[PDB]
Amino acid sequence: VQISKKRKFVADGIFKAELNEFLTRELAEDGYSGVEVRVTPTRTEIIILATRTQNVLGEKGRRIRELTAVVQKRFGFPEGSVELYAEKVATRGLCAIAQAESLRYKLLGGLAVRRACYGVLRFIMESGAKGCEVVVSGKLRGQRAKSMKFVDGLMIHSGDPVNYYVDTAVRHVLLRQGVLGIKVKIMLPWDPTGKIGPKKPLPDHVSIVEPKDEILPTTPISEQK
């Protein structure tokens, strides 16, 4: 007797949600990017993606042990069945999930908003994106809540491409005055995935190969080969 396939796939995604939320909660100040759960009946391998792997590992490898034992104790599945593996992002700048947590830490560290936003902006513009934007909203310079917007490069706001090119990542930062929201929409480029960018191009761009310059006919030549 097992769980029905509908509730098997519903309860599988909720496990991927609680673990992701917890790893965000803990490693907000460690450059954590994401979770790749690969299910193996021997041991389920959870690959954590983070910016600096030495911070999440810690000295001697002590921090990930608490993590793997917590996820052993919480989710009910028996011990000796989960294997955590911390790994670096293929492109740290291009991944907006890891990047949007950097600006949160920069604002939390006492920076002026506009300077750190330009820092993140130029870092991800030089990182290789075709276009990006950052919207920080809140009580920036007063009791009146104005909105701040940094746009350069290109953007696709509508159409199926907006599902697999832009990487929307909203985060909340807690300051003395209150709460500021951060949106970082980084559009992925083309050049299919040698660890960078999706395969299919934008569903509008047509590129035309120039012809090979062929030999114009001068004399009918019969060459036996």
Binding site: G93, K106, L111, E210
Partner: protein
Amino acid sequence: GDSKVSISFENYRKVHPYEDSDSSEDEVDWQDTRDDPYRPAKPVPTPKKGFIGKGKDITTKHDEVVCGRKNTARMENFAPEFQVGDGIGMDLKLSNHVFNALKQ
């Protein structure tokens, strides 16, 4: 440069066995390090004698370069409706004759 209807130069490309050569794959990461210019200077307390050092390399009080960088950083704390640009990435030595007009 950015057109949708584009041309491809594939036929004129001669030889490309190993396209992913390790020359254009430089890992540029300077944000979390201490090499990013977008970081506070950890300000020194104000000198009382009005200068730092001696001899010919005496760095004075205002010291137009330093004061220009300071005025740029003071621009960074303006109103949200103001637009600045990239004044820290490019070394912007902005003077009080200009900064005071922008502040006004």
